[PDB]
Ligand binder design. Structure first.
Ligand SMILES: COc1ccc([C@H]2C[C@H]3c4c(nc5ccc(Br)cc5c4N2)CCN3C(C)=O)cc1Cl
Ligand SMILES: [Mg+2]
Ligand SMILES: [Zn+2]
Length: 285
């Protein structure tokens, strides 16, 4: 309750001051409270506080509870990863022109899902996992003092909840592989149409996965430090080769396809390539 005090009072700087619009954004320099201000700003400049009548102290308390339910002792799957998946989500919506293709509940749900998609992650040394993630997301969203969706109507609330659930489950890399063939097939032959409700949900699943792994598209010194955070989880509880395989099989074709839909999502495709080149050179010693 001490943390709520200093955050609920502080003035939330502009999105441009916080740089959360760059695809090339990083969070190392930021304290925990600074990531909270950036989170409020994301909600704010996505017109979410406006359209859904969010009270400032509920959002502050909701963010701090989401942060609380990540585990600082887990190397990579922590609030910083949740914060970053939400930031790239923001950068994709604004800097990537993607905002206009989605309804407000779709954007309000994508952002809530991005922030919550890994809640209570113990580390990979322990879609089962993602159902627990959504349950955590649901508990806090209904915890008293945190109900940021209270301004929503009943069928507004029902819709947002369903989209939140789909998106947290979408972060399952298994479901990504199952459904990405249809997304790639559709973009392959000018057949992609968002007005089809099915193609829209499929796209939301792809967009979540694109932000979930967006650390691979970062500037090399940041992506290298994140890849270090990843290794600390994996064995501390070779690397350049596994990185190229991960990029080859998982990341590249997705960011390729997202670049087709939004040519301003290209920094993610480009940054992923620049990291593949660096990882490929290293893999050869
Ligand atoms: C030696 O230690 C590693 C092992 C494997 C890897 C590969 C693959 C890896 C993996 C996963 N997420 C990532 C997110 C961001 C970045 Br940046 C790299 C990632 C990543 N890279 C999940 C899938 N996954 C698996 C199952 O192994 C990197 C490292 Cl350091
Ligand atoms: Mg997960
Ligand atoms: Zn994740």
């Amino acid at each position: 309750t001490r943390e709520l005090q200093s955050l609920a009072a502080a003035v939330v700087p502009s999105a441009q001051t916080l740089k959360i619009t760059d695809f090339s954004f990083s969070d190392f320099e930021l304290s925990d409270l600074e990531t909270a201000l950036c989170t409020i700003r994301m909600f704010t400049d996505l017109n979410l506080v406006q359209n859904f009548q969010m009270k400032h102290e509920v959002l502050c308390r909701w963010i701090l509870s989401v942060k609380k339910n990540y585990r600082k002792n887990v190397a990579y799957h922590n609030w910083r990863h949740a914060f970053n998946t939400a930031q790239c989500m923001f950068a994709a919506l604004k800097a990537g022109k993607i905002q206009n293709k989605l309804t407000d509940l779709e954007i309000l749900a994508l952002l809530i899902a991005a922030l919550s998609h890994d809640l209570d992650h113990r580390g990979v040394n322990n879609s089962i996992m993602e159902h627990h993630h959504f349950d955590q997301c649901l508990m806090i969203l209904n915890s008293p003092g945190n109900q940021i969706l209270s301004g929503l109507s009943i069928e507004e609330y029902k819709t947002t909840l369903k989209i939140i659930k789909q998106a947290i489950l979408a972060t399952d890399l298994a479901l990504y592989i199952k459904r990405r063939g249809e997304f790639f097939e559709l973009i392959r032959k000018n057949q992609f149409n968002l007005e089809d409700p099915h193609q829209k949900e499929l796209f939301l699943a792809m967009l979540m996965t694109a932000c979930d792994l967006s650390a691979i598209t970062k500037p090399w010194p940041i992506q290298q430090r994140i890849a270090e955070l990843v290794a600390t989880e994996f064995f501390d509880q070779k690397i350049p080769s596994m990185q190229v395989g991960f990029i080859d099989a998982i990341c590249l074709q997705l960011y390729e396809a997202l670049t087709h839909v939004s040519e301003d999502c290209f920094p993610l495709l480009d940054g992923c390539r620049k990291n593949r080149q660096k990882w490929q050179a290293l893999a050869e010693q």
